[PDB]
Design a protein around this ligand. Structure first.
Ligand SMILES: N[C@@H](Cc1c[nH]c2ccccc12)C(=O)O
Ligand SMILES: N[C@@H](Cc1c[nH]c2ccccc12)C(=O)O
Ligand SMILES: N[C@@H](Cc1c[nH]c2ccccc12)C(=O)O
Ligand SMILES: N[C@@H](Cc1c[nH]c2ccccc12)C(=O)O
Ligand SMILES: N[C@@H](Cc1c[nH]c2ccccc12)C(=O)O
Ligand SMILES: N[C@@H](Cc1c[nH]c2ccccc12)C(=O)O
Ligand SMILES: N[C@@H](Cc1c[nH]c2ccccc12)C(=O)O
Ligand SMILES: N[C@@H](Cc1c[nH]c2ccccc12)C(=O)O
Ligand SMILES: N[C@@H](Cc1c[nH]c2ccccc12)C(=O)O
Ligand SMILES: N[C@@H](Cc1c[nH]c2ccccc12)C(=O)O
Ligand SMILES: N[C@@H](Cc1c[nH]c2ccccc12)C(=O)O
Ligand SMILES: N[C@@H](Cc1c[nH]c2ccccc12)C(=O)O
Lengths: 134, 134, 134, 134, 134, 134
C-alpha cells in the first residue's frame, strides 16, 4: 500500500507515525508548491498526518483537503478526534489523535490496532465506499 | 474482513463476541450521533451485535437499521433467534442469540461454527446476495 | 464454499453426508416456514440432501425446488440416481443416492470421489453453466 | 479442472487414459440417453476419449459432437491423429492417438507431455480461443 | 505459458531453443498444411523460432506471418536482429538471433536473460500492447 | 515488472541504477531510430534513466518524451530533482537524481527506499493515475 501527496501551497507538512505499542510522531518532511511525495506504509511507519492545502491520492480515489486494510479521515471542522482501540483480550484507547480542519490522517490496522473510533464532523473513505458523519 | 458503523442517534451500542468454545459478550462501546466506528474480525472477536439507529456498511453493501466467510442478520420484528451449530462429528446448538427489532448481528464461520439456523422475520445478506425470510 | 437454504413450507429436511470412505447419512435438521439455514462444506460434511419446498441459493445462482469444485442436482421426476465413482487406480460405484422429485443434492469432489454418474430426468448446475438431461 | 458429458444417444462411451510414462486405455463407462457424467483430471487420469453423439461442456464453452493447462480436439473427418511429444532434453512421439469422426479428446499437459501435434481435419479449442484446421 | 502454431503451407518449421547459459538450437518439427502444434515453455525450452506461412496464436492475440513474462517478435523485412543481454552485475550480448521476413520468435525472460535489444523493421507484441518499429 | 523503450531518434541512451545501499550508474546501452529495448527490474537493477526522443510504454500506459510497486517521472522543464528517502528508523536523502527536460526516470520502492520527494515541473504516473505538478 502507498499514497501520493501534492502541495497546492507552501508549508504543507507530512508527519509519520511509529508502528508498535508506542504511538508517537516521526519527524516530518516539508513540501512546497508543486512538490510531490510518494510514500509507502512500512514496518516503522503505519500512519501519516497531512496538514495544509494538498491533493491526497490513494487506491480508493482522490481527495482535496482545501474543499469542504487502511482507511482515510478528513476533518470538515476543528474538534475531530481519532481513537485507537487495542487488539487482544482488552479494549482500551491507547492513542487519541486530534485533527484540525483540512488535516487528513491515513492509517492502517496493525498488530496493536483492530478498531478505531471517530468523533465530530469528518469525511471518511474506505475500500467499500465513502462516509460522511454529518 | 472489516465493517463500518455510523450512528444516526445517541446511545447506539456495539457488542463484541468471544471466539472459541465459549460464546459470551465482550464489553461494549457507545456511539453518539455522528460518531463512526471501524473494526475488524480478529482472533478474539468473531461476531458483533449492533443496537440502535445506525448505518452498517460492509463489503456486501450498506444497511439501514431504522428502515424496515461472514454473513449479516437484521431483525424485521422481535423474536428473531440465531443458533450456532457445532463443527465436527456432532451437530448441536451451542449458542442461541436473540435479536430485537432493529438489531443487527454480523458473524463469521469459525473453527467452532460451520452452520447456523435463523428463525422468524429477518433480513439476511451474504456474498452471493440478499435474502428475506418473510 | 457454502450454501443457503430457506423453507417455503414446514417439514423441510436437510441431511448431511459423511466425508471419507464411508458414505452414510449425518443426522438432519428441520426447517419451518421462514426459517433459514446457512452451512459450509467441512472436513466431516462434503454433501447434503434437501427435501421439500425450499429456496436453495449458491455461488452459481438461485434454485426453486417447487418449480419444474462442487455441483448441484435437482430431480424433475422420481427415479433419479447419483453414483459416486472411486478416485484412484480403480473405478467403481461406492455409493448410489436416490433422489425423489423436488429433492436437491449438493456435493463436492473429494479425496474418494473424482467422478459421478447421473441418471434420469434431472437438472444439473455447475460453475460453467446449467444442464438439463431431458 | 473438470468437464461434463451428456449423451444424446445410447452407447456413448468415455475412455480414461493413464498419466505417466505409459499411455494406455483406462476401462470405460457407458452412458445412455439422458445420462450425465461429471469427472475431473486426477493423478491417474490425465486425458479422456469420448465417442458418440454427446454434449461436451467445459470451462472454455460447450461442444456438440454430432454437428460438423488443457485443450480439446474434435474430428471433422476420419484420419485425425494426435501425437504426444516428450518433455525434457529429447523430443519424440511417445503416443499416437487416432480420432474418428465425432470423437472428442480432452487432454492436459503433464510431466511427460509438453507439446502435441495434430493432423488432418479437426476442431481445436483452447483457453485463448477456438481454431479450425480446414 | 503456451502458444499455438497452425500451418497455412507445407514446410513450416518450428525450432526450439535451449534454456541456460548456452543458447543453441533444439531439433525442429515440421508442419504440413492444416497441421497444428501446441507447445509450452519448459525447463529445457525457453524460446522458439517459427518459419513459413503460419497462424501464431498466444495469450496476447493472434498473428499472421504472411501479412505485412514473454514477448513476440515478427520481421517485416530481412535484417532483424534480437540480442540477449545477460542478467547480473554485467551486461553483455551473449546471443544474437537473426530473423528473416515472415519469421517469428517467441521468447521469455529467464535466469540468464533480463533484457533484450531489437533492431530493424519488426513487429513486437507484449502483454501491455503491440509496438511497431517503423 | 518490465517496460519498453523505442527510439524516435538516434543517440537515445538508457542508464541502469544499482539496487542496494549504494545508488550509482550502471553502464548504459544506446538505441538508434527504430530500435527497441525490453528490460525488467532485477536484483541488481531497480531504476533506469531514459534520455532522448523515445516512446516509453509500461503497465500504466504509454509516454512520449518529446511532447510537453513502481512509479514514473518525466521532466517538463530543466531543474527537476528526485530524492530517495531511507527506509527504517531514520529518514534521510541518500540520493539526489537530477532530470533534464525530456528525461524519464522509472524507479521502484526497494529495501532501501520507501519514500521519494519530487521537485519542480514534472509529470508523474502511478498505478492509480497520473499527476502533474504544475
Ligand atoms: N502505533 C500504532 C499506530 C496506529 C495505527 N492505527 C492507528 C489509528 C489511530 C491512531 C494510531 C494508529 C499501531 O501501529 O497500531
Ligand atoms: N480487542 C478486540 C477489539 C475489537 C475487535 N472487534 C471489535 C468490535 C467491537 C469492539 C471491540 C472490537 C479484539 O481484537 O477482538
Ligand atoms: N464463539 C463463537 C462465536 C460465533 C461465531 N459464529 C456465530 C454464530 C452465531 C452465534 C455465535 C457465533 C465462534 O467463534 O464460533
Ligand atoms: N458438524 C457438521 C456441521 C455441518 C456442516 N454442514 C452441514 C450441513 C447440514 C447439517 C450440518 C452440517 C460438520 O462440520 O460437518
Ligand atoms: N463420502 C463421500 C461423499 C460424496 C462426495 N461426493 C459424492 C457424490 C455422490 C455421492 C456421495 C458423495 C466423499 O467424501 O467422497
Ligand atoms: N479412478 C479414476 C476416475 C476417473 C477420473 N477421470 C475419469 C474419466 C472417466 C472415467 C473415470 C475417471 C481416476 O481417478 O483417475
Ligand atoms: N500418459 C500421458 C497422457 C497424455 C497427456 N497428454 C496427452 C496428449 C496426447 C496423448 C496422450 C497424452 C501423460 O500423462 O503425459
Ligand atoms: N522436450 C522439449 C519439448 C518442447 C517444448 N517446447 C517445444 C517447442 C518446439 C518443439 C519442442 C518443444 C522440452 O521440454 O523443452
Ligand atoms: N538460453 C537463453 C535463451 C533465451 C531467452 N530469451 C532470449 C532472448 C533472445 C535470445 C535468446 C534467449 C535463456 O534461457 O536465457
Ligand atoms: N544485468 C542487468 C541487466 C539489466 C536489467 N535492467 C536493465 C536496464 C537497462 C540496462 C540493463 C539492464 C540486471 O540484471 O540488472
Ligand atoms: N539503490 C536504490 C535505487 C533507487 C530505488 N528507488 C529510487 C528512487 C530514487 C533514487 C534512487 C532509487 C535502491 O535500490 O533503493
Ligand atoms: N523511514 C521511514 C520512511 C517513511 C515511510 N513512510 C513515510 C511517511 C512520511 C515520512 C517518512 C516515511 C519508514 O520506513 O517508515
Amino acid at each position: 500500500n502507498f499514497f501520493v501527496i501534492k502541495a497546492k501551497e507552501n508549508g504543507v507538512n507530512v508527519f509519520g507515525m511509529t508502528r508498535g505499542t508506542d504511538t508517537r510522531f516521526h519527524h516530518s518532511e516539508k513540501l512546497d508548491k508543486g512538490e510531490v511525495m510518494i510514500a509507502q506504509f512500512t514496518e516503522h511507519t503505519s500512519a501519516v498526518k497531512i496538514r495544509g492545502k494538498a491533493i491526497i491520492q490513494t487506491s480508493y480515489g482522490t481527495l482535496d483537503t482545501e474543499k469542504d486494510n487502511f482507511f482515510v479521515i478528513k476533518a470538515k471542522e476543528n474538534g475531530v478526534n481519532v481513537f485507537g482501540m487495542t487488539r487482544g483480550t482488552d479494549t482500551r484507547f491507547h492513542h487519541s489523535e486530534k485533527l484540525d480542519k483540512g488535516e487528513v490522517m491515513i492509517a492502517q490496522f496493525t498488530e496493536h490496532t483492530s478498531a478505531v473510533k471517530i468523533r465530530g464532523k469528518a469525511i471518511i473513505q474506505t475500500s467499500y465506499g465513502t462516509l460522511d458523519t454529518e
